[PDB]
Amino acid sequence: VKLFRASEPILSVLMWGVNHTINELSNVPVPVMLMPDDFKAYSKIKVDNHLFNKENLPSRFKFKEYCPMVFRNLRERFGIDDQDYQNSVTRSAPINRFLTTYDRRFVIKTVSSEDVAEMHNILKKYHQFIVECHGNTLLPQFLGMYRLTVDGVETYMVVMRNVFSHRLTVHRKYDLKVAREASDKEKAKDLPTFKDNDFLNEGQKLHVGEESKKNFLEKLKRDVEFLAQLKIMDYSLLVGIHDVDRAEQPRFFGPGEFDPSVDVYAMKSHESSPKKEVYFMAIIDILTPPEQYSKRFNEFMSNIL
Amino acid sequence: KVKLFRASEPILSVLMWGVNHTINELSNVPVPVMLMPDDFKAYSKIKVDNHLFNKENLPSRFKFKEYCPMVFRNLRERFGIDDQDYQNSVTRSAPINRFLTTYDRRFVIKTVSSEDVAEMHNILKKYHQFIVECHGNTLLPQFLGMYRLTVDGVETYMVVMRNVFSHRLTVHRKYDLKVAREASDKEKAKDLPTFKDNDFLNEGQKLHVGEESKKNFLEKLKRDVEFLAQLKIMDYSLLVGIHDVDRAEQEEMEVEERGPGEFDPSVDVYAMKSHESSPKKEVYFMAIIDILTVNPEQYSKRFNEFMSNILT
């Protein structure tokens, strides 16, 4: 029995709605191809119960899913099974607006109306790019877009795949994009989002060796050249470090052990490295709309190995 | 596994979608220890506005409303009907025939008026109490769900109930029994006509069910019609259908050119096998119908006296 019991009611609706839309979709055949109307399409349901099923859901709420055929195909192209997607959203309420599924596999971010407009303006070219690189990309991986209405207030959310491991703790984090640095305020939280400058003054490097590095650089170049060819900028590269040794301090998951089909942004450290670490790296914040930025970004990221 | 909801008309496509949706939603709702009064005033409503999406068989825009869903789910249980069976008979394939039956001939769906829905509401508490007191064994209609469909801004009310006839045994002749009424020359020349009382009397058909079957039938008919009278209900009928075992044998064999008279009382719940010493081997289906509405007490008495006189 799925009760959709959640930390907040909007989360109960998110769970009900992803459950509902994924079931609905399972009755819609998979097309030979997507058509242009699939990029202008939407699913909308309005719920007015009365003295019924009110234990965990509101009696009245609205759920809208944008481009359901497109995002279903994207999910497939990212290797994500539709029932797995549904289970991570509905088996248990998401947690900590910014959320993750109970199982830490997927991320749910509240977004603006404008960001939705921007996702639409870029969706056809983004889908075409996803297919051209066979799902192997450092860009955000959008798995669904939804509009929730509960108490006459609309809330937009985008579900995408996590950059970090769903099982390996990320010990330090950096956000790379002038000069930007972390506040005495930011620096005082548990795991701070340190910006570029503080990572430079710290002097950490990531040794992945030539073989890994070459193909990684290939993929980063492809992504930023695409984002430039769409005149998008102010995007960042998010990078997280996991120290196996620190993690140390009946089937047992091993130390620094992970599944690359699941933690798709992860890389093991090279043999010639100071500490044994695992790294997660991917591009973020790509919905706020120059080409020159592509150049500075790629050169910046280039000098770490 | 894919359900397409393909139907000859959009209303049936919505019917199938809605029974599917409501039975699934219900599957996440715990089954209560008992019903509460709010369950008799409750309803579920969904409104669907798709756009350039999922348009092959469903309208892009439609609404579906289910009345007292907890109650009809309990009724489903008390009639021995599984919810998964219910949804499958309605949604594996479009129903056929407004008044229609599911593809598998198990269940019947009748359009009704708004007033019929109000009347079902006013009587539902006492009807549920009656169903539970008789452990589901009754000749009355067995209501399994009540729905309101809106397609092209038009509301259509529908009641799902169990078929009086067998889902496997062919009904060869049928009557509607309650002054004097008979079947029209229009009716009398139709495929399987609805013969009224007078044609049954002038024809002189009788039903040989043997003593024990007759006695149990008359006992439950008395309980049922006293209930309907205690509800000041009238204009209801007794529906009667005849299956000739020997004829069914021949017509299976004749389609072959190009057991017999056995049935499941768990499934064909209005059915009765013919007495051992009976001219022909027959099966009978009999039930009360049309109860969503000169004196009701006299109606009960006369109805019971009449129907008493058509059995052996």
Ligand SMILES: Nc1nc(N)c2ncn([C@@H]3O[C@H](COP(=O)(O)OP(=O)(O)OP(=O)(O)O)[C@@H](O)[C@H]3O)c2n1
């Ligand atoms: N005795 C009783 N108890 C109830 N609990 C009950 N419930 C409904 N009925 C009646 O049937 C109609 C159903 O559609 P409703 O009219 O209710 O549908 P609703 O009111 O949402 O919107 P509409 O105005 O667009 O139709 C009602 O107007 C009544 O005529 C009820 N009757």
Ligand SMILES: Nc1nc(N)c2ncn([C@@H]3O[C@H](COP(=O)(O)OP(=O)(O)O)[C@@H](O)[C@H]3O)c2n1
């Ligand atoms: N096999 C079967 N099983 C049932 N449960 C069942 N219930 C009702 N019928 C039909 O309802 C109508 C009476 O109901 P009513 O609306 O007053 O007359 P019509 O307008 O339809 O002529 C008649 O056609 C009955 O034969 C049924 N047939």
